[PDB]
Ligand binder design. Structure first.
Ligand code: HEM
Length: 182
């Protein structure tokens, strides 16, 4: 994944646990070769997996718990690191933002030529609810989606409930989330 993601994980950890813990995690991930992450450069996905793996061990939290926190964090972090306007242009309510998600990543795709974005499809069920379909070339990021969704609730001062109803891991085609909103 592009360095932007790894910088943000690094950032999240450092803001919450200081530079000491970060160097520990960096060490255990097998990444002391790397002085700093470069925002617009492509890294091996393994760099992120090893990062989440390490932070899990060092912090005593499960990976999935961290993916959830990171998901929330990403919504705030992107607006402060170059992407406020793009976010503002993706909608002024959660259901709208979700519809615009593939379009948003297309936009990002222009700056980031090697992007491997997720695909998201909304099937509405009422004015307060929807099925979100999440398809990816990567495994086990569904917990991140959950956090992103809550991050967006926080963004649009909107109450959301998110429940995964289908799991790649059980053998289903793709992850599906049922979502209810204010
Ligand atoms: C301006 C805001 C955003 C930017 C700049 C951005 C950019 C990115 C980038 C660079 C990646 C890594 C993909 C790669 O390197 O191949 C990514 C991944 C991802 N993004 Fe976004 N993103 C934004 C907002 C969002 C939001 C709000 C969601 C909410 C669903 C989202 C969903 C995801 C997911 C689930 C992934 C994991 C990749 C995968 O599933 O394979 N993104 N995004």
């Amino acid at each position: 994944m592009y360095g932007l993601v790894n910088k943000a994980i690094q950032d999240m950890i450092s803001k919450h646990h200081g530079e000491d813990t970060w160097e520990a995690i960096k060490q255990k991930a097998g990444l002391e070769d790397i002085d700093f992450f470069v925002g617009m450069e492509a890294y091996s996905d393994d760099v992120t997996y090893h990062l989440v793996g390490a932070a899990s061990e060092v912090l005593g939290k499960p990976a999935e718990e961290l993916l959830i926190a990171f998901g929330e964090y990403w919504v705030t972090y992107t607006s402060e690191e170059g992407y406020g306007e793009l976010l503002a242009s993706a909608g002024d309510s959660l259901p709208e933002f979700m519809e615009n998600l593939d379009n948003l990543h297309a936009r990002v795709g222009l700056s980031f030529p090697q992007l491997r974005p997720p695909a998201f499809e909304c099937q509405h069920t009422s004015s307060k609810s929807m099925e979100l379909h999440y398809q990816s070339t990567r495994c086990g990021l569904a917990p991140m989606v959950l956090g992103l969704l809550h991050g967006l609730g926080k963004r649009f001062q909107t109450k959301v409930e998110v429940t995964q109803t289908a799991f790649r891991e059980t053998g289903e085609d793709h992850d599906i989330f049922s979502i209810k909103y204010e």
